[PDB]
Design an enzyme around this catalytic site. Structure first.
Site, PDB file in Angstrom:
ATOM      1  N   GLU A  23     -11.253   0.459  -0.682  1.00 23.00           N
ATOM      2  CA  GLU A  23     -11.820  -0.836  -0.314  1.00 23.00           C
ATOM      3  C   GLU A  23     -12.449  -0.786   1.084  1.00 23.00           C
ATOM      4  O   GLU A  23     -12.180   0.132   1.870  1.00 23.00           O
ATOM      5  CB  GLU A  23     -10.754  -1.932  -0.372  1.00 23.00           C
ATOM      6  CG  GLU A  23     -10.159  -2.147  -1.759  1.00 23.00           C
ATOM      7  CD  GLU A  23      -9.026  -3.158  -1.749  1.00 23.00           C
ATOM      8  OE1 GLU A  23      -9.307  -4.374  -1.747  1.00 23.00           O
ATOM      9  OE2 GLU A  23      -7.852  -2.740  -1.738  1.00 23.00           O
TER      10      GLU A  23
ATOM     11  N   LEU B 286      -6.415   5.486  -4.693  1.00 25.70           N
ATOM     12  CA  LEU B 286      -5.080   5.005  -4.391  1.00 25.70           C
ATOM     13  C   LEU B 286      -5.015   4.489  -2.966  1.00 25.70           C
ATOM     14  O   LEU B 286      -5.606   5.072  -2.046  1.00 25.70           O
ATOM     15  CB  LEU B 286      -4.039   6.104  -4.640  1.00 25.70           C
ATOM     16  CG  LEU B 286      -4.123   7.369  -3.792  1.00 25.70           C
ATOM     17  CD1 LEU B 286      -3.188   7.258  -2.598  1.00 25.70           C
ATOM     18  CD2 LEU B 286      -3.793   8.605  -4.611  1.00 25.70           C
ATOM     19  N   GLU B 287      -4.347   3.341  -2.833  1.00 24.71           N
ATOM     20  CA  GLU B 287      -4.093   2.723  -1.539  1.00 24.71           C
ATOM     21  C   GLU B 287      -2.602   2.584  -1.172  1.00 24.71           C
ATOM     22  O   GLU B 287      -2.261   2.244  -0.080  1.00 24.71           O
ATOM     23  CB  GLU B 287      -4.877   1.431  -1.414  1.00 24.71           C
ATOM     24  CG  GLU B 287      -6.344   1.746  -1.341  1.00 24.71           C
ATOM     25  CD  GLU B 287      -7.262   0.543  -1.313  1.00 24.71           C
ATOM     26  OE1 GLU B 287      -6.798  -0.574  -1.554  1.00 24.71           O
ATOM     27  OE2 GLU B 287      -8.434   0.759  -1.021  1.00 24.71           O
ATOM     28  N   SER B 288      -1.760   2.937  -2.117  1.00 25.88           N
ATOM     29  CA  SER B 288      -0.326   2.908  -1.895  1.00 25.88           C
ATOM     30  C   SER B 288       0.031   3.779  -0.701  1.00 25.88           C
ATOM     31  O   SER B 288      -0.327   4.955  -0.658  1.00 25.88           O
ATOM     32  CB  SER B 288       0.397   3.434  -3.132  1.00 25.88           C
ATOM     33  OG  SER B 288      -0.149   4.683  -3.528  1.00 25.88           O
TER      34      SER B 288
ATOM     35  N   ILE C  74      -1.127   3.914   2.140  1.00 29.37           N
ATOM     36  CA  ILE C  74      -2.240   4.250   3.016  1.00 29.37           C
ATOM     37  C   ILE C  74      -2.291   3.304   4.218  1.00 29.37           C
ATOM     38  O   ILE C  74      -2.915   2.242   4.176  1.00 29.37           O
ATOM     39  CB  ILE C  74      -3.593   4.282   2.261  1.00 29.37           C
ATOM     40  CG1 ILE C  74      -3.551   5.319   1.133  1.00 29.37           C
ATOM     41  CG2 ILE C  74      -4.722   4.616   3.220  1.00 29.37           C
ATOM     42  CD1 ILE C  74      -3.346   6.737   1.611  1.00 29.37           C
TER      43      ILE C  74
END
Ligand SMILES: CC(=O)N[C@@H]1[C@@H](O)[C@H](O[C@@H]2O[C@H](CO)[C@@H](O)[C@H](O)[C@H]2NC(C)=O)[C@@H](CO)O[C@H]1O
Length: 326
Positions: free
Chosen positions: A160, A114-116, A118
């Site tokens: 990523e 998850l990158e939400s 971040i």
């Protein structure tokens, strides 16, 4: 868990590549990352329902794979894996929902993709002591969940490159934003497989730019984690090397698996692998940080099992044979 792994994402959905039932997955995959646990309106309570089967049948399929030595991991992420933990209340909903799901289906571990939310807030400058609530709370939750199941429990993550290797260039916003998360859970982390794709180009520790989908790029990006690196242009702020057995590389199974590029042919990738693992060079521009390699390098992750099956099992067949040969 084996010393050279193939970790494969498994679509809990049909995106045109079809659904593969768990018992029909190639045995060449060691770990199956079920994609994905998702959230509703509260952006914190994780939910998961299998795309096929009753809950009992899906649980039974998982148990079967586990009986064969495979690991089945719940991955949290994807477009609906929006997870925001602005406070302790949100953190607790996340912890409790994930534990409930692990208990319910018998998952072997969790994968954090998850990158939400971040982002390193202004002033959040020390990767050993983060201050951004999303980051602090995510670390706390992961540690809590890990502690709930012990060291046999598998913990992976798939950020990523900007969030990890990007920390070499900048530390703020998304840049280096997974570094505090990695450092914060490094004693619980089974492996990290950064996504070496949809990534454009990356700067290696030699200060050179490398294009995704090339052997030099794979070595350069991995070496940052195998060796450690200075963060954000600060020679006195060194992000420490992970154990080699904690380092994997994430790759697209087929060209179409990563529409923005990043696919690398197995022929070229095996050159990178021979260099990373054995210290045997291939005439590339990038110089590995260790003369004679990192033998414990953990292996390869791929998006995805489904894409691989549509591409004549190129990824699974090529890399299983490569690793078996070591
Ligand atoms: C773990 C992770 O972040 N996986 C990424 C995938 O989400 C992504 O694939 C795309 O996933 C969407 C669901 O989140 C699907 O709707 C979409 O069809 C799918 N696209 C493809 C090409 O399969 C890929 C994109 O390259 O990156 C993964 O790393």
């Amino acid at each position: 868990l084996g010393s050279k792994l193939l970790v494969g994402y498994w679509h809990n959905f049909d995106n045109g590549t079809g659904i593969i039932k768990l018992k029909d997955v190639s045995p060449k995959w060691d770990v199956i990352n079920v994609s994905f646990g998702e959230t509703g309106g509260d952006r914190s309570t994780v939910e998961f329902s299998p795309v096929y089967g009753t809950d009992a049948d899906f649980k039974s399929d998982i148990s079967y794979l586990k009986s064969k030595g495979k690991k089945v991991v719940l991955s949290i992420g994807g477009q609906n894996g929006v997870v925001l933990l602005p406070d302790n209340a949100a953190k607790d909903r996340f912890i409790n929902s994930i534990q409930s799901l692990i208990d319910k289906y018998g998952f072997d571990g969790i994968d954090i993709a998850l990158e939400s939310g971040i982002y390193l807030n202004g002033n959040d400058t020390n990767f050993k002591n983060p201050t951004t609530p999303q980051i602090v709370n995510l670390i706390s939750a992961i540690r809590t969940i890990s502690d709930h199941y012990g060291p046999d429990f598998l913990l992976s993550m798939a950020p990523e490159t900007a969030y990890v290797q990007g920390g070499y260039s900048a530390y703020g916003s998304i840049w280096g934003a997974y570094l505090p998360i990695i450092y914060g859970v490094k004693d619980k982390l089974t492996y990290i497989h950064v996504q070496h794709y949809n990534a454009g180009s990356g700067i290696g520790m030699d200060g050179n730019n490398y294009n995704q989908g090339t052997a030099d790029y794979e070595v350069a990006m991995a070496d940052m984690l195998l060796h450690g690196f200075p963060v954000g242009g600060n020679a006195n702020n060194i992000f420490p090397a992970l154990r080699s057995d904690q380092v994997m590389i994430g790759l697209p199974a087929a060209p179409a698996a990563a529409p923005s590029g990043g696919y690398i042919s197995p022929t070229e990738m095996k050159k990178a692998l021979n260099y990373i693992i054995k210290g045997v060079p291939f005439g590339g521009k990038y110089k590995l940080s260790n003369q004679s390699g990192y033998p414990a390098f953990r292996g390869l992750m791929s998006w995805s099992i489904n894409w691989d099956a549509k591409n004549n099992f190129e990824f699974s067949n090529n890399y299983r044979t490569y690793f078996d040969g070591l």
